[PDB]
């Protein structure tokens, strides 16, 4: 076991505080927590000082997932609160990751954390993708940026997201760009749409 | 297998954030992602915040290149989406880069990403090279710097680049410098062209 | 119609009263729209010339329509007798005025079948097309999309009038390709012209959905 | 259809004239709404490929619809011949253009039955779904409840357009769950959002009754 | 349906295409009003479980309605299997999904007849009542006579909503006795209250005729 580096922890804390909760926080967390034990994940979550509402939301989601784990799961085989790192030693957490065959308590807990952060990101997104609409004078580039950030925060299935991508982007544009996007015809691509609507 | 470092990820995120999509981001990405797996490349692309129009265009370009790989190439072998890292697992990626000969899935995906990024740079060029014109009291050093920055962004063919460096550069200069550059005559390299124009 | 007996012999089956009532409702209520011709074809499936005459008796209330229908039937009978100089069916035998029902059953049951009923049916359909074109309320050049009219409804009106007016197939293809785009309203004609030449109707309708 | 003889042998029973008239009324008057597909399925129960072709002849008045219907039928026939290289039915035999009626009766009476009629029926229903989606007046994103519109009528319009637009089942489930609530009018959308996620349509309709 | 052969043996008679078209028109055009249940009962007279499933296939276009219909059918099948632990019909045999048509004919022809078709019919009618109550536009408390509305039309609306809402018989009797008088317009409610308690509907309609 190697301790979470001070630079890595400061990086995680700074991205959380500065970025608030944007969709990129999920991949940033996943990258910064490669190989992390539940103790290290708890360190990463507790070290954050701001957004205490969201940290409570994350703790509640972790508790729900742990309760479901205990419901489905009555060296000792870990329980939900054991996987969450609150009723386990760091040595026992090193166990089940060095076990043969290892049951990765760290990654299981990380999945729960990712679910909680998805819920948090969806809540923190300013508006729904069905509500994102181009302004009368907004450039198509800016409208596309807002649309796809919101779609990234949308949390729907991938097929639904594909349908959203192909339909809502054209549907929600202002009439000046909506006519051009229709003249582009169906089956267009974002490069062609954005070059056409640069004017 | 080694995961990409937090310092490297912070550097990539920061350079994207501050440079937007100036041409040097392509070589910066190529340098920072040396030895990267498809998972590492996906981490680098997903950790970026903002520029979501550009990131979607990159996704579409990657999907197109994956389709071309599927057309050209109809344990489990790598499909286009496998080289993209969307479907394949990290163990499959490691194995494909580990065979002798290996399938360098990291480099193939990197080439696709570089194609997408070149398209993004070409679209994010703030102004066309035809509109780069020297100011009334602008130094020729600054003017030609702007001209060649734009020319790097345009990514025209070498014949058009040679023609436009020879002709449009001197056409778009102010009269005071334009007279000097015309007196120099054709065939002047950039070194001679701008050293004769100092002051 | 004609139906095999219990022991297999073919015999005439009279056209039912409610089928005749359905044809009467088509003639009276539909005002000789283009849809009377599909309904005449459907209601008279298997009909012998006697049954077709029974149906035509209901058109006699419309004097001009019956008159031009009869004149078209006579002209097609003459065209038949030009090429065709029980007995062989005369032009007036196909029309079921000089013949008897048993000859009609025999002709319909010949090997190969002499499709006397279907021949008279096609003559009657020619006459009905003439009547429908006569009663058309507007020419195809007069159909123009309204400011708020959906493209689907305008296309429906355009193709209904196209069925009524009965131009040649080349002229019909040109009309659908060009005149449909020309008469559309400006907010929609912009998209139609943007789609360019060779635009199939599916592309035109999908692109123009909700433009009103 | 096919019906047993008096002595038990199966024989073709021609599709009745008034059933064809009913299908003609569906084609002409219904304007290719989503309800033409249930009515095509109902009116063509037991139909042989010859009967299905007889019904399809009435769609020929709509030139674009008939064209795309035929193209879909040909593509499905090719898909059949890909997997299937009296005789074994060819793709054009299922379509009832190269075959004869007796082969169709035999295939429908095989042990186990070769459901040639139902296969052609499903091909035709695919083509009809394509036509219905083409003729849809509005996309599902355009259905929005009015200020005084009852929630029942708005739900009816939403689900009619949902049948017309034919998204995938996952996308349809999402649309009913989310987009239905999104497009409702504010006085009603308040209650819809108050019901929370996982609200069945019965709860949404009972809660929203009389809110207009 | 089931019909005796020429020699007396019972055999399945397929539900006709136009009867299925009539049921399709009821499902599509009637919007699940209270009158769909009498029409389902009428159109499915003598229907076997296979015929009832054939009819239910047309409701599948309405996804929520079909879903709750199936759930009600399953719950009633479970209630049947609770009391009932060729073979004896299972709950899924009454639903015509695990059984075969011949067993259904045999059960319908037993001495005494096992009314499998009518049992499934009553289950389907329960589900249809649930759907009708779901789709009811207004509650019975919202029906109020207009200033100029005749008492006959208001009574018609009141009793239509009463059929839709499906309260218990005691509550229905109270509603007809009291709530009908309460919601009437003042010029008419004066006469209604003057008639006093125990006023039959005939007295209320005769007294209130022409009061608008």
Chain A residues whose CB is inside 8 A of the B10 CB are 11
Sign of torsion over alpha carbons A166, A172, A176, A177: negative
Euclidean distance between CA atoms D152 and B122, whole angstroms: 52
B57/A191 touch (CB, cutoff 8 Å), yes or no:
yes
Specify the CATH architecture of the domain B129-196: Orthogonal Bundle (1.10)
Superfamily of C2-135 according to CATH: Human Immunodeficiency Virus Type 1 Capsid Protein (1.10.375.10)
Euclidean distance between CA atoms C176 and C172, whole angstroms: 6
Euclidean distance between CA atoms E212 and E201, whole angstroms: 18
CB-based contact, B100 to chain A, within 8 Å: no
Q: Which residues pair with E198 in a beta bridge?
A: none
Euclidean distance between CA atoms B88 and B92, whole angstroms: 6
D residues 144-163 lying closer than 8 A (beta carbon) to E: 150, 152-153, 156, 159, 163
CB-based contact, A191 to chain D, within 8 Å: no
Euclidean distance between CA atoms A176 and A182, whole angstroms: 11
- Specify whether the backbone of C90 is left (phi greater than 0), alpha (psi in -120 to 50) or beta: beta
Q: How far is E208 from chain D (nearest CA, A)?
A: 28
Euclidean distance between CA atoms E183 and E163, whole angstroms: 17
Neighbours of chain A (3+ CB pairs under 8 A): B, C, D
CA atoms within 13 A on the CB side of E207: 17
Q: Which residues pair with D2 in a beta bridge?
A: D12
CB-based contact, C39 to chain D, within 8 Å: yes
A183/C203 touch (CB, cutoff 8 Å), yes or no:
no
Burial label, B21 (beta-carbon count in 10 A; 0-12, 13-18, 19+) = buried
Q: What is the fold, at CATH topology level, of the domain defined by A6-124?
A: Human Immunodeficiency Virus Type 1 Capsid Protein (1.10.375)
C205/D68 touch (CB, cutoff 8 Å), yes or no:
no
Euclidean distance between CA atoms C139 and C165, whole angstroms: 7
CB-based contact, D20 to chain C, within 8 Å: yes
CB-based contact, B2 to chain A, within 8 Å: no
B48/A148 touch (CB, cutoff 8 Å), yes or no:
no
Give the nearest chain C residue to A175 (CA atoms): C211
C153: closest CA among E66, D135, A181, D154?
Answer: D135
Q: Which residues pair with B61 in a beta bridge?
A: none
Query: Which two structure tokens, joined as six digits, stand for E154?
Result: 């208001």
**Phi, psi at residue B71, to the nearest 5°?**
-65, -45
E61: closest CA among D164, C45, B156, B169?
Answer: D164
CB-based contact, B49 to chain A, within 8 Å: yes
Q: Which residues pair with C10 in a beta bridge?
A: C4
What is the distance in angstroms between the CA of the first residue and the CA of the last residue of chain A? Answer: 57
Alpha carbon of D105 to those of B16, C157, D17, D59, D113: distances in Å? 70, 41, 21, 25, 10
Q: Choosing among A191, A198, A199, which should be mutated to test the B contact, i.e. which has the most B CBs within 10 A?
A: A191
Give the nearest chain C residue to A186 (CA atoms): C207
Match domain A129-197 to its CATH number in 1.10.1200.30, 1.10.8.640, 3.90.1300.10, 3.40.50.740.
Answer: 1.10.1200.30
Give the nearest chain D residue to A161 (CA atoms): D171
Q: How far is B134 from chain A (nearest CA, A)?
A: 25
Give the β-pairing of D10-12 and E2-4. unpaired
Euclidean distance between CA atoms E189 and E199, whole angstroms: 13
Nearest to A130 among D139, D168, D182 (CB): D182
E58/D41 touch (CB, cutoff 8 Å), yes or no:
yes
**Other C-beta atoms within 10 Å of D6: how many?**
10
Euclidean distance between CA atoms D105 and D102, whole angstroms: 5
Euclidean distance between CA atoms E77 and E90, whole angstroms: 8
Binding residues of A: 7
Query: Which two structure tokens, joined as six digits, stand for A97?
Result: 């990751």
C156: closest CA among C42, C35, C40?
Answer: C35
Alpha carbon of D162 to those of C202, D42, D169: distances in Å? 19, 21, 11
Task: Note the resolution in Å, 1 decimal.
Answer: 3.1
Per DSSP, helices labelled H in C84-115 are 91-94, 101-108
Q: How far is D59 from chain A (nearest CA, A)?
A: 27
- Only one residue has tokens 């007294």, namely E207
Question: In chain D, what is the greatest distance between 2 CA atoms, to the nearest angstrom?
Answer: 68
Euclidean distance between CA atoms E183 and E159, whole angstroms: 13
Euclidean distance between CA atoms E137 and D20, whole angstroms: 36
Chain E residues whose CB is inside 8 A of the D202 CB are 64, 68, 134
**Other C-beta atoms within 10 Å of C5: how many?**
8
Chain A with chain D: Cβ pairs closer than 8 A: 21
Angle at E155 between CA E151 and CA E159, to 5 degrees: 175
Chain E residues whose CB is inside 8 A of the D6 CB are 6
CB-based contact, D135 to chain C, within 8 Å: yes
Contact D145, D204 (CB under 8 A): no
Chain D residues whose CB is inside 8 A of the E134 CB are 201-202, 205-206
Rg (CA), chain B: 22
C203/A182 touch (CB, cutoff 8 Å), yes or no:
no
Chain A residues whose CB is inside 8 A of the D170 CB are 157, 159-160
Enter the DSSP assignment of E138: S
Q: How far is D210 from chain A (nearest CA, A)?
A: 27
C195/A185 touch (CB, cutoff 8 Å), yes or no:
yes
Which sequence spans correspond to the domains of chain B?
A: 6-124, 129-196
- Only one residue has tokens 């009539």, namely E22
Binding residues of A for ATP: 7
Euclidean distance between CA atoms B33 and B51, whole angstroms: 20
B66: closest CA among B55, B81, B77, B56?
Answer: B81
Any binding-site annotation on B7? yes
Task: Look at residue D179 and give its three-state secondary structure.
Answer: helix
| The domains spanning A6-124 and A129-197 adopt the same CATH topology | no
Give the nearest chain D residue to C169 (CA atoms): D63
Give the nearest chain B residue to A33 (CA atoms): B6
**Other C-beta atoms within 10 Å of D153: how many?**
14
Q: Which residues pair with C4 in a beta bridge?
A: C10
């Amino acid at each position: 076991h190697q301790a979470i580096s001070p630079r890595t922890l400061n990086a995680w804390v700074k991205v959380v505080e500065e970025k608030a909760f944007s969709p990129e926080v999920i991949p940033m967390f996943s990258a910064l927590s490669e190989g992390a034990t539940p103790q290290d994940l708890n360190t990463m979550l507790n070290t954050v000082g701001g957004h205490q509402a969201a940290m409570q939301m994350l703790k509640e989601t972790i508790n729900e997932e742990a309760a479901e784990w205990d419901r489905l799961h009555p060296m000792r085989e870990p329980r939900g609160s054991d996987i969450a790192g609150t009723t386990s030693t760091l040595q026992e957490q090193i166990g089940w990751m060095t076990h043969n065959p290892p049951i990765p308590v760290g990654e299981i807990y990380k999945r729960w954390i990712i679910l909680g952060l998805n819920k948090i990101v969806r809540m923190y997104s300013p508006t729904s993708i069905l509500d994102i609409r181009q302004g009368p004078k907004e450039p198509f580039r800016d409208y596309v940026d807002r649309f796809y950030k919101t779609l990234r925060a949308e949390q729907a299935s991938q097929e639904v997201k594909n349908w959203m991508t192909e339909t809502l982007l054209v549907q929600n544009a202002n009439p000046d760009c909506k006519t051009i996007l229709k003249a582009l015809g169906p089956g267009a691509t974002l490069e062609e749409m954005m070059t056409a609507c640069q004017g």
